[PDB]
RNA sequence: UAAGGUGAUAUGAACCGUUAUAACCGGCGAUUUCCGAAUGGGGAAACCCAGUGUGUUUCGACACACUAUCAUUAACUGAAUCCAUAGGUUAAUGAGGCGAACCGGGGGAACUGAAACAUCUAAGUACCCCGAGGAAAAGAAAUCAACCGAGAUUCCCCCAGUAGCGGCGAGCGAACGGGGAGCAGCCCAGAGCCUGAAUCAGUGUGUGUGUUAGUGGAAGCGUCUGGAAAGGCGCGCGAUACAGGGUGACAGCCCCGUACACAAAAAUGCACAUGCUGUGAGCUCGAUGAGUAGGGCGGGACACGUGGUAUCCUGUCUGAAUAUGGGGGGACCAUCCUCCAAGGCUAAAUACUCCUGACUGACCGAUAGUGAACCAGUACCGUGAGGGAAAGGCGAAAAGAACCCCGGCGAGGGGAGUGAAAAAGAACCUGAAACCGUGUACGUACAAGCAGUGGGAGCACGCUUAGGCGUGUGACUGCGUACC
């Protein structure tokens, strides 16, 4: 019902977390295809 | 890096000012080589309000690049490429293909 | 003196010159107090000499 | 083998130009060979010798 | 080297500097705002605090130095236990950190061409996990045969789509026989005589010559037309240089490529000549590590998919003999052959083009090509896990509204104008499409039936010594159903 989009930090630890996107191999290919090979940036680290 | 040493006379010939003659130029990284400023009638800018607004209409930057006539002397504008021999120890100044060096 | 002209010296600027050379940035470099017709921005155009010691001391201590 | 080679009896008048073998060329001034390519007459048209 | 420069895409402004460190190229080395991959322990990525030392201080404190899990060998230390062992305190050293993909380990599908689906194919691919180097997996014969023989392996055309298995089904799919590619043998289980004699891991030296600076590097004028003549002609000269595209165009003629001569600090390619630390060479005499195999029943990949049965496997278990043979002879065993004692080692052939370097383009010339021209994996959707765009492009000189005039101290135009151009004017493409506004003349506020092509009056306009035509909505009405 309480739909939907919102920002927060503490909810990133099981889903949205940068060190977990490197810890999991499933994230690790994405991370390189998105910046190191993908010519780009993220920088949203806050 | 050009080995022809900035004291020297040139003209326009690769454009409609054909004949217009002058020396030393103004030379920096990527300069359009403006001869001696051989411009006609071309505006200047009026941003300032106070008593000094730039009343100018000539000699601002008007282009013809690198060099099309290898330093004039009498007539003729080749060879450019030719690189000579020793004169200064650490560098070499140049003239053209019948006159050794300056 | 671009540092390279003084290399003969028995000791390096950490001996206390490090502060005489840097006081200007916090005491004179404000609005017009270091100048208005003569100076402007000093630290790289001329005064770049001081940064150069910070490799050199590591360089020399090992030689 | 394969009568492919037989064109010189199709033309016979302007073409296979039976003359002399290749040694005659300069070569550092190959610009000159126009003067010497006159025995075959051809000057420059198709510069082979086979 | 040769002179200018301050990585920029508002360039305002300082300030180096054309003497040989102003930048900037290049060998090597040196740089720490805290995270750090990060590692004393903690983790909600950008840490917030333990430990113990150090040069020294206006004696507040300080910038700084170092530690961990393992694999492996020294030293000290130490249990419920004389002893054993296990476990800590150090000493040393390297890897744990990171790749798209190959390759070794196995896994690994669902449905779906079979016209039915619980065999198979599907499929050894999605991925996920683990290794460790640039090459690998391999490989030194219980190999293959007929008594002719061949030699790690197999590769490459075959023979052949032959043998050869099946819901008798769709798929899978050999080897021998011939030609070839090939074309060589050791070491322990260990003692002796011999003894820096053969190799290579390293680590310094000289050349033979790389890597790239530095060195370089070609021809012409006049004229009619002319914003640039770099077209045309003339040949006045040219050629192993007539790539391709730049310079405002179309330039053998200026180019920048080639073709060719000269040459580096200082590590360092690779080949050798060497030198310092370490290895093993020569020639005898010794030497022989079975739980290995067998079966009887399971699970098996094998050309053979359950079946009578075939190994070299694999797992509960059981359990010999040293080559005075039997392990096996792609049913079982002869006649008789071949590997060989079950430990370790081999030149060639294969693949990965990370990216960057040389040459070809009946290949991509933005309906595309490596997601890639970008600076677009970037922003317009994502509880998100991230799917990734609508998208090529002013153009001598930013030559980017000098100047004048009106209006809202505005928008836009009317002339000037850099200009070939504003039909290049910064809602930057030299440029029609769906639809529109004012108009030359039509038909016309009693309308029918894909709005017609006919057959024709004269009308806005145009040519004609007068000659029935060059022009379209379309008074009369005739003909109809244009589709697929």
UniProtKB/Swiss-Prot annotation, chain A:
Transmembrane segments: none annotated. Keywords: Ribonucleoprotein, Ribosomal protein. GO terms for biological process: cytoplasmic translation. PROSITE patterns: RIBOSOMAL_L34. GO terms for cellular component: cytoplasm; cytosolic large ribosomal subunit. One of its GO terms (molecular function) is structural constituent of ribosome. Part of the 50S ribosomal subunit. Belongs to the bacterial ribosomal protein bL34 family. This is Large ribosomal subunit protein bL34. It comes from Escherichia coli (strain K12).
From Swiss-Prot, chain B:
The gene is rplX. GO terms for molecular function: large ribosomal subunit rRNA binding; structural constituent of ribosome. GO terms for cellular component: cytoplasm; cytosol; cytosolic large ribosomal subunit. One of two assembly initiator proteins, it binds directly to the 5'-end of the 23S rRNA, where it nucleates assembly of the 50S subunit. It is not thought to be involved in the functions of the mature 50S subunit in vitro. One of the proteins that surrounds the polypeptide exit tunnel on the outside of the subunit. It holds the Pfam family ribosomal_L24. Keywords: Ribonucleoprotein, Ribosomal protein, RNA-binding, rRNA-binding. SMART domains: KOW. PROSITE patterns: RIBOSOMAL_L24 (PS01108). HAMAP family: Ribosomal_uL24_B. CDD domains: KOW_RPL26. PANTHER family: MITOCHONDRIAL RIBOSOMAL PROTEIN L24. Part of the 50S ribosomal subunit. Might contact the SecYEG translocation complex when it is docked with the ribosome. GO terms for biological process: cytoplasmic translation; ribosomal large subunit assembly; translation. Belongs to the universal ribosomal protein uL24 family. It comes from Escherichia coli (strain K12). This is Large ribosomal subunit protein uL24. NCBIfam families: rplX_bact. InterPro entries: KOW, Rib_uL2_dom2, Ribosomal_uL24, Ribosomal_uL24_CS, Ribosomal_uL24_KOW, Translation_prot_SH3-like_sf.
From Swiss-Prot, chain C:
Disruption phenotype: Cells missing both S17 and L29 grow very slowly and have a rather unstable temperature-sensitive phenotype. GO terms for biological process: cytoplasmic translation; ribosomal large subunit assembly. Gene3D superfamilies: 6.10.140.1970. Pfam families: Ribosomal_L29 (PF00831). One of its GO terms (cellular component) is cytoplasm. Keywords: Ribonucleoprotein, Ribosomal protein, RNA-binding, rRNA-binding. One of its GO terms (molecular function) is structural constituent of ribosome. It comes from the Bacteria. NCBIfam families: L29. Part of the 50s ribosomal subunit. Contacts protein L23, trigger factor and protein nascent chains. Might also contact SecE and probably does contact SecG when the SecYEG translocation complex is docked with the ribosome. Belongs to the universal ribosomal protein uL29 family. Binds 23S rRNA. It is not essential for growth. This is Large ribosomal subunit protein uL29. It comes from Escherichia coli (strain K12). The gene is rpmC.
Curated annotation (Swiss-Prot), chain D:
The erythromycin sensitive allele is dominant over the resistant allele. Belongs to the universal ribosomal protein uL4 family. This is Large ribosomal subunit protein uL4. One of the primary rRNA binding proteins, this protein initially binds near the 5'-end of the 23S rRNA. It is important during the early stages of 50S assembly. It makes multiple contacts with different domains of the 23S rRNA in the assembled 50S subunit and ribosome. Protein uL4 is a both a transcriptional repressor and a translational repressor protein; these two functions are independent of each other. It regulates transcription of the S10 operon (to which uL4 belongs) by causing premature termination of transcription within the S10 leader; termination absolutely requires the NusA protein. uL4 controls the translation of the S10 operon by binding to its mRNA. The regions of uL4 that control regulation (residues 131-210) are different from those required for ribosome assembly (residues 89-103). The gene is rplD. Changing residue 33 to P: Does not regulate the S10 operon in vivo. Part of the 50S ribosomal subunit. In TnaC-stalled ribosomes forms part of the binding pocket for L-Trp with the leader peptide and uL22. It comes from Escherichia coli (strain K12).
